Design an enzyme around this catalytic site. Structure first.
Site, PDB file in Angstrom:
ATOM      1  N   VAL A 129       0.855  -1.167   0.000  1.00  0.00           N
ATOM      2  CA  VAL A 129       0.000   0.000   0.000  1.00  0.00           C
ATOM      3  C   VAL A 129       0.901   1.229   0.000  1.00  0.00           C
ATOM      4  O   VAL A 129       1.828   1.344   0.806  1.00  0.00           O
ATOM      5  CB  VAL A 129      -0.943  -0.024   1.214  1.00  0.00           C
ATOM      6  CG1 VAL A 129      -1.714   1.287   1.348  1.00  0.00           C
ATOM      7  CG2 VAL A 129      -1.918  -1.190   1.136  1.00  0.00           C
ATOM      8  N   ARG A 135      -2.711   2.649   6.998  1.00  0.00           N
ATOM      9  CA  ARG A 135      -3.447   2.779   8.256  1.00  0.00           C
ATOM     10  C   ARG A 135      -4.902   3.164   8.044  1.00  0.00           C
ATOM     11  O   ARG A 135      -5.445   3.925   8.839  1.00  0.00           O
ATOM     12  CB  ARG A 135      -2.853   3.816   9.215  1.00  0.00           C
ATOM     13  CG  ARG A 135      -1.490   3.362   9.703  1.00  0.00           C
ATOM     14  CD  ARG A 135      -0.601   4.440  10.284  1.00  0.00           C
ATOM     15  NE  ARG A 135       0.764   3.897  10.221  1.00  0.00           N
ATOM     16  CZ  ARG A 135       1.647   4.138   9.253  1.00  0.00           C
ATOM     17  NH1 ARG A 135       1.470   5.161   8.430  1.00  0.00           N
ATOM     18  NH2 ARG A 135       2.717   3.367   9.130  1.00  0.00           N
ATOM     19  N   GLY A 139      -4.589  -2.526   3.286  1.00  0.00           N
ATOM     20  CA  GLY A 139      -3.748  -3.714   3.258  1.00  0.00           C
ATOM     21  C   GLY A 139      -4.498  -4.956   3.737  1.00  0.00           C
ATOM     22  O   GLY A 139      -4.391  -6.024   3.157  1.00  0.00           O
ATOM     23  N   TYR A 173      -0.625 -11.665  12.035  1.00  0.00           N
ATOM     24  CA  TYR A 173      -1.046 -12.862  11.332  1.00  0.00           C
ATOM     25  C   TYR A 173      -1.682 -13.855  12.303  1.00  0.00           C
ATOM     26  O   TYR A 173      -2.674 -14.497  11.960  1.00  0.00           O
ATOM     27  CB  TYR A 173       0.126 -13.513  10.583  1.00  0.00           C
ATOM     28  CG  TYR A 173       0.820 -12.599   9.584  1.00  0.00           C
ATOM     29  CD1 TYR A 173       0.099 -11.755   8.753  1.00  0.00           C
ATOM     30  CD2 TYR A 173       2.209 -12.593   9.457  1.00  0.00           C
ATOM     31  CE1 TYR A 173       0.738 -10.931   7.834  1.00  0.00           C
ATOM     32  CE2 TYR A 173       2.851 -11.773   8.546  1.00  0.00           C
ATOM     33  CZ  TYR A 173       2.116 -10.910   7.751  1.00  0.00           C
ATOM     34  OH  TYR A 173       2.777 -10.086   6.852  1.00  0.00           O
TER      35      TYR A 173
END
Lengths: 198, 201
Positions: A129, A135, A139, A173
């Site tokens: 991005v 932010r 993404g 993740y």
């Protein structure tokens, strides 16, 4: 601000090449950046979406969007922000200055395979991005698009790699329910070693 | 009386053999509880593209009689004179008219760097059935993928190794592979993957 995720076509090659340029600059990989527009364009002409090299592009616009494979329709999300976004390079990423559409990011992915499942999966090579649009969820949207597409197509897994020291990424993740299969190491045969095989 | 060998592209008729090879690999690795592969899954996923454009299988086949010329490298195999104890050979014979036996496979597919001009190959699996090991066949399978990459102007061949498997690591290093120690594999699967279908984009 309106956003849309769509499949890249060959006419998007300049934007994709510029995104990779920015990514290589950010990640300090410009010394190995040998991909060319014509090489990318060849790949985009040659590749069937979701069965080979695939790019989703993220585009943004101050006005709403109109709304390349049987297996896909575009993803969308509206945002809100009377914060100015300072993007003086927006022109370099705009397929349309009449309507003020700007490419803000991309994901490059391709099929992998689980022999144990007899099911294809997707491997995500890169998500990028551009700095002015970070932010804001974009993404995460790009990752989501790949995951959704996998589910739509009955694919088994979505995979990628992470730098072992990048604790922020690892935690992100893990939070979304990815597993880190931490015993595996990537092995690579390239250059003279590869050429030796004839 | 030497054993002859060849490497060839798998076609749809090879689906049963590929299924049985993956099954044997799961057995060898003690991961039978994770094996849910089906013949119909293999058939509908492996053959949607031309060879080398997507998922590609090379099969290793052996015969006590020579193979007529029609991906077998420079034939550098050994221990070819040894008796074969292969009671399952019947399960791996593509033609009961002949004595041809499927002895192993490699499954691979293209990968791509954002930064580099050329694609690569990623190797998902190499398996040689126990009776046919230590004759050079597994090395031949790896060699076949590497030579295909060089032939197609691809820039790299990649795979993974377990961090504790020092013998495998040394073997890969001996052929000039590098181990990229910083990377860790991440995997979204099962319910965590399915949960993304609820996201309204």
């Amino acid at each position: 601000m309106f956003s849309r995720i769509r499949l890249a076509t060959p006419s998007d090659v300049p934007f994709i090449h510029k995104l990779i340029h920015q990514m290589a600059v950010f990640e300090r990989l410009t010394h190995l950046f040998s991909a060319t527009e014509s090489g990318l364009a060849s790949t985009l002409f040659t590749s069937r979406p979701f069965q080979s090299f695939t790019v989703f592009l993220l585009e943004v616009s101050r006005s709403p969007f109109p709304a390349p494979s049987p297996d896909f329709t575009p993803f969308f999300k509206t945002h809100n922000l009377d914060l100015p976004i300072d993007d003086p390079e927006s022109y370099n990423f705009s397929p349309d200055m009449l309507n003020d559409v700007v490419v803000a990011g991309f994901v490059l992915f391709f099929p992998n395979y689980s022999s144990f499942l007899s099911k294809p999966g997707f491997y995500i090579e890169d998500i990028f991005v551009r700095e002015p649009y970070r932010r804001k969820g974009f993404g995460s949207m790009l990752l989501t698009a790949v995951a959704k597409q996998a589910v739509k197509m009955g694919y088994g897994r979505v995979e990628w790699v992470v730098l072992d020291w990048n604790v922020n990424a690892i935690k992100f993740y893990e939070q979304m329910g990815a597993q880190i299969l931490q015993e595996w190491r990537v092995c690579r045969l390239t250059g003279d070693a590869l050429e030796a095989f004839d």
